[PDB]
Design a binder for this molecule. Sequence first.
Ligand code: CFF
Lengths: 119, 117
Amino acid sequence: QVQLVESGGGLVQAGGSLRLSCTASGRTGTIYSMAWFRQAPGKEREFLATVGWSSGITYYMDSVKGRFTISRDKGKNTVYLQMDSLKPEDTAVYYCTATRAYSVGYDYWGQGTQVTVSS
Amino acid sequence: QVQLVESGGGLVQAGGSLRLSCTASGRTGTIYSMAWFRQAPGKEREFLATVGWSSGITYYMDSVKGRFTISRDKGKNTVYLQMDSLKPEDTAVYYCTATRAYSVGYDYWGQGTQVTV
Ligand SMILES: Cn1c(=O)c2c(ncn2C)n(C)c1=O
Protein backbone atom coordinates (compact mmCIF):
# COMPACT_ATOMS: atom_id res chain seq x y z
CA GLN A 1 0.00 0.00 0.00
CA VAL A 2 3.08 2.26 -0.18
CA GLN A 3 5.52 2.07 -3.10
CA LEU A 4 9.13 3.31 -3.11
CA VAL A 5 11.31 3.76 -6.17
CA GLU A 6 14.99 4.63 -5.80
CA SER A 7 16.97 6.43 -8.48
CA GLY A 8 20.28 8.28 -8.72
CA GLY A 9 22.83 5.47 -8.44
CA GLY A 10 25.90 5.52 -10.63
CA LEU A 11 29.67 5.39 -10.98
CA VAL A 12 31.65 8.12 -9.23
CA GLN A 13 35.33 8.76 -8.53
CA ALA A 14 36.88 8.84 -5.04
CA GLY A 15 36.43 12.17 -3.28
CA GLY A 16 33.46 13.20 -5.43
CA SER A 17 29.79 13.49 -4.64
CA LEU A 18 26.48 11.89 -5.60
CA ARG A 19 22.84 12.46 -4.58
CA LEU A 20 20.31 9.64 -4.37
CA SER A 21 16.52 10.01 -4.49
CA CYS A 22 13.50 7.94 -3.57
CA THR A 23 9.95 8.71 -4.64
CA ALA A 24 7.09 7.53 -2.40
CA SER A 25 3.59 6.73 -3.60
CA GLY A 26 0.44 5.39 -2.00
CA ARG A 27 -0.77 6.28 1.53
CA THR A 28 2.25 8.40 2.46
CA GLY A 29 0.42 10.06 5.31
CA THR A 30 0.96 6.86 7.32
CA ILE A 31 4.78 7.23 7.28
CA TYR A 32 6.59 8.44 10.36
CA SER A 33 10.22 8.23 9.14
CA MET A 34 12.40 7.15 6.19
CA ALA A 35 15.79 5.46 6.14
CA TRP A 36 18.53 4.50 3.66
CA PHE A 37 20.27 1.11 3.83
CA ARG A 38 23.07 -0.32 1.75
CA GLN A 39 24.29 -3.82 0.90
CA ALA A 40 27.83 -4.23 -0.39
CA PRO A 41 28.61 -7.33 -2.51
CA GLY A 42 28.60 -10.45 -0.35
CA LYS A 43 27.91 -8.42 2.82
CA GLU A 44 24.67 -7.84 4.73
CA ARG A 45 22.24 -4.91 4.66
CA GLU A 46 23.51 -1.97 6.74
CA PHE A 47 21.42 0.83 8.27
CA LEU A 48 22.91 4.29 7.52
CA ALA A 49 20.63 7.24 8.28
CA THR A 50 17.06 8.26 9.04
CA VAL A 51 14.92 11.44 8.83
CA GLY A 52 11.63 12.25 10.55
CA TRP A 53 9.05 12.36 7.75
CA SER A 54 7.29 15.32 9.38
CA SER A 55 10.08 16.56 11.65
CA GLY A 56 13.07 16.78 9.35
CA ILE A 57 15.32 15.85 12.27
CA THR A 58 18.16 13.55 11.32
CA TYR A 59 20.34 10.78 12.72
CA TYR A 60 23.50 9.36 11.18
CA MET A 61 25.56 6.27 11.95
CA ASP A 62 29.23 7.06 12.56
CA SER A 63 30.29 5.40 9.28
CA VAL A 64 28.61 8.10 7.15
CA LYS A 65 28.20 11.00 9.60
CA GLY A 66 29.73 14.28 8.43
CA ARG A 67 29.95 12.98 4.82
CA PHE A 68 26.29 12.10 4.01
CA THR A 69 23.20 14.27 4.51
CA ILE A 70 19.64 12.95 4.61
CA SER A 71 16.67 15.20 3.91
CA ARG A 72 13.08 15.09 2.69
CA ASP A 73 10.71 17.17 0.55
CA LYS A 74 7.19 16.50 1.83
CA GLY A 75 5.68 18.44 -1.07
CA LYS A 76 7.44 16.35 -3.72
CA ASN A 77 7.17 13.05 -1.79
CA THR A 78 10.90 12.47 -1.97
CA VAL A 79 13.76 11.69 0.39
CA TYR A 80 17.38 12.34 -0.54
CA LEU A 81 20.78 11.04 0.49
CA GLN A 82 23.47 13.58 -0.36
CA MET A 83 26.76 11.62 -0.40
CA ASP A 84 29.99 13.70 -0.13
CA SER A 85 33.65 12.64 -0.01
CA LEU A 86 32.87 9.15 -1.33
CA LYS A 87 35.42 6.37 -1.08
CA PRO A 88 35.69 2.80 -2.54
CA GLU A 89 34.16 1.24 0.55
CA ASP A 90 30.91 3.12 -0.21
CA THR A 91 30.36 0.79 -3.24
CA ALA A 92 26.98 -0.91 -2.69
CA VAL A 93 23.32 -1.38 -3.62
CA TYR A 94 21.48 1.37 -1.71
CA TYR A 95 17.89 0.83 -0.54
CA CYS A 96 15.34 3.30 0.78
CA THR A 97 12.72 2.36 3.36
CA ALA A 98 9.71 3.72 5.18
CA THR A 99 8.41 2.91 8.65
CA ARG A 100 4.71 3.43 9.33
CA ALA A 101 3.31 5.29 12.30
CA TYR A 102 2.90 3.06 15.39
CA SER A 103 4.61 0.28 13.46
CA VAL A 104 8.23 -0.75 14.10
CA GLY A 105 11.16 -1.55 11.87
CA TYR A 106 11.13 -1.19 8.09
CA ASP A 107 7.74 -1.93 6.54
CA TYR A 108 8.36 -0.98 2.88
CA TRP A 109 11.42 -1.29 0.62
CA GLY A 110 12.46 -0.14 -2.81
CA GLN A 111 14.12 -2.20 -5.52
CA GLY A 112 17.54 -0.76 -4.71
CA THR A 113 19.94 1.41 -6.69
CA GLN A 114 23.62 0.74 -7.42
CA VAL A 115 26.46 3.07 -6.38
CA THR A 116 30.03 2.41 -7.51
CA VAL A 117 33.14 4.29 -6.36
CA SER A 118 36.59 3.90 -7.86
CA SER A 119 39.94 4.96 -6.43
CA GLN B 1 18.06 11.45 30.09
CA VAL B 2 18.18 7.63 29.82
CA GLN B 3 20.91 5.14 30.81
CA LEU B 4 21.16 1.58 29.46
CA VAL B 5 23.23 -1.33 30.81
CA GLU B 6 23.58 -4.66 29.01
CA SER B 7 24.10 -8.15 30.41
CA GLY B 8 24.50 -11.78 29.41
CA GLY B 9 26.59 -12.79 26.44
CA GLY B 10 29.90 -14.63 26.22
CA LEU B 11 31.38 -17.72 24.59
CA VAL B 12 29.36 -20.20 22.51
CA GLN B 13 29.96 -23.09 20.12
CA ALA B 14 28.71 -23.42 16.56
CA GLY B 15 25.01 -24.28 16.52
CA GLY B 16 24.31 -23.16 20.10
CA SER B 17 22.36 -20.36 21.70
CA LEU B 18 22.84 -17.32 23.93
CA ARG B 19 20.53 -14.88 25.73
CA LEU B 20 21.30 -11.17 26.03
CA SER B 21 19.65 -8.59 28.28
CA CYS B 22 19.56 -4.84 28.90
CA THR B 23 18.04 -2.60 31.58
CA ALA B 24 16.85 1.00 31.20
CA SER B 25 16.63 3.82 33.72
CA GLY B 26 15.78 7.51 33.75
CA ARG B 27 12.99 8.91 31.58
CA THR B 28 11.87 5.43 30.57
CA GLY B 29 8.28 6.34 29.72
CA THR B 30 9.43 8.49 26.80
CA ILE B 31 10.94 5.45 25.05
CA TYR B 32 9.19 4.36 21.85
CA SER B 33 11.36 1.42 20.82
CA MET B 34 14.54 -0.50 21.55
CA ALA B 35 16.85 -2.30 19.15
CA TRP B 36 20.00 -4.43 18.97
CA PHE B 37 23.04 -3.77 16.76
CA ARG B 38 26.31 -5.65 16.37
CA GLN B 39 29.86 -4.54 15.53
CA ALA B 40 32.62 -6.99 14.62
CA PRO B 41 36.27 -5.90 14.92
CA GLY B 42 37.02 -3.08 12.49
CA LYS B 43 33.57 -3.22 10.89
CA GLU B 44 30.60 -0.90 11.19
CA ARG B 45 27.65 -1.17 13.55
CA GLU B 46 24.92 -3.31 11.98
CA PHE B 47 21.22 -3.02 12.88
CA LEU B 48 19.66 -6.38 13.72
CA ALA B 49 16.20 -6.34 15.33
CA THR B 50 13.66 -4.03 16.93
CA VAL B 51 10.76 -4.20 19.40
CA GLY B 52 8.06 -1.68 20.28
CA TRP B 53 8.43 -0.58 23.93
CA SER B 54 4.66 -0.26 24.46
CA SER B 55 3.30 -2.28 21.50
CA GLY B 56 5.52 -5.37 21.35
CA ILE B 57 5.64 -5.44 17.53
CA THR B 58 8.96 -6.81 16.20
CA TYR B 59 10.96 -6.97 12.96
CA TYR B 60 14.20 -8.65 11.81
CA MET B 61 16.87 -8.31 9.14
CA ASP B 62 17.07 -11.35 6.87
CA SER B 63 20.50 -12.05 8.39
CA VAL B 64 19.00 -13.12 11.74
CA LYS B 65 15.29 -13.55 10.91
CA GLY B 66 14.08 -16.90 12.21
CA ARG B 67 17.15 -17.55 14.33
CA PHE B 68 17.09 -14.61 16.75
CA THR B 69 14.10 -13.55 18.88
CA ILE B 70 13.70 -10.07 20.45
CA SER B 71 11.28 -9.30 23.30
CA ARG B 72 10.61 -6.81 26.12
CA ASP B 73 9.23 -6.75 29.68
CA LYS B 74 8.01 -3.22 30.23
CA GLY B 75 7.51 -3.23 34.01
CA LYS B 76 11.03 -4.51 34.74
CA ASN B 77 12.49 -2.01 32.22
CA THR B 78 14.32 -4.80 30.43
CA VAL B 79 14.77 -5.95 26.84
CA TYR B 80 16.19 -9.28 25.69
CA LEU B 81 17.68 -10.77 22.52
CA GLN B 82 17.43 -14.57 22.24
CA MET B 83 19.98 -15.85 19.70
CA ASP B 84 19.51 -19.47 18.58
CA SER B 85 21.39 -21.52 15.97
CA LEU B 86 24.61 -19.52 16.10
CA LYS B 87 27.23 -19.36 13.32
CA PRO B 88 30.82 -18.03 13.45
CA GLU B 89 29.66 -14.99 11.42
CA ASP B 90 27.77 -13.78 14.54
CA THR B 91 30.94 -13.03 16.50
CA ALA B 92 30.75 -9.31 17.44
CA VAL B 93 30.13 -6.79 20.22
CA TYR B 94 26.35 -6.41 20.59
CA TYR B 95 24.83 -3.04 21.54
CA CYS B 96 21.34 -2.17 22.75
CA THR B 97 19.74 1.18 21.97
CA ALA B 98 16.63 3.16 22.84
CA THR B 99 14.66 5.51 20.60
CA ARG B 100 12.77 8.38 22.23
CA ALA B 101 9.20 9.18 21.21
CA TYR B 102 9.04 11.87 18.47
CA SER B 103 12.76 11.43 17.90
CA VAL B 104 14.49 9.40 15.18
CA GLY B 105 17.46 7.12 15.08
CA TYR B 106 19.23 5.78 18.13
CA ASP B 107 19.41 8.30 20.95
CA TYR B 108 20.82 6.23 23.83
CA TRP B 109 23.43 3.48 23.76
CA GLY B 110 24.64 0.80 26.12
CA GLN B 111 28.31 0.04 26.51
CA GLY B 112 28.19 -3.25 24.57
CA THR B 113 28.73 -6.93 25.31
CA GLN B 114 30.86 -9.61 23.61
CA VAL B 115 29.56 -12.64 21.69
CA THR B 116 32.07 -15.19 20.39
CA VAL B 117 31.14 -18.22 18.24
C1 CFF C 1 10.40 6.90 17.14
N1 CFF C 1 9.06 6.59 16.64
C2 CFF C 1 7.98 7.29 17.21
O1 CFF C 1 8.16 8.10 18.13
C3 CFF C 1 6.74 6.97 16.60
C4 CFF C 1 6.64 6.07 15.59
N2 CFF C 1 5.34 5.92 15.18
C5 CFF C 1 4.67 6.74 15.98
N3 CFF C 1 5.46 7.40 16.86
C6 CFF C 1 5.02 8.34 17.89
N4 CFF C 1 7.71 5.41 15.08
C7 CFF C 1 7.58 4.46 13.98
C8 CFF C 1 8.97 5.66 15.61
O2 CFF C 1 9.94 5.05 15.21
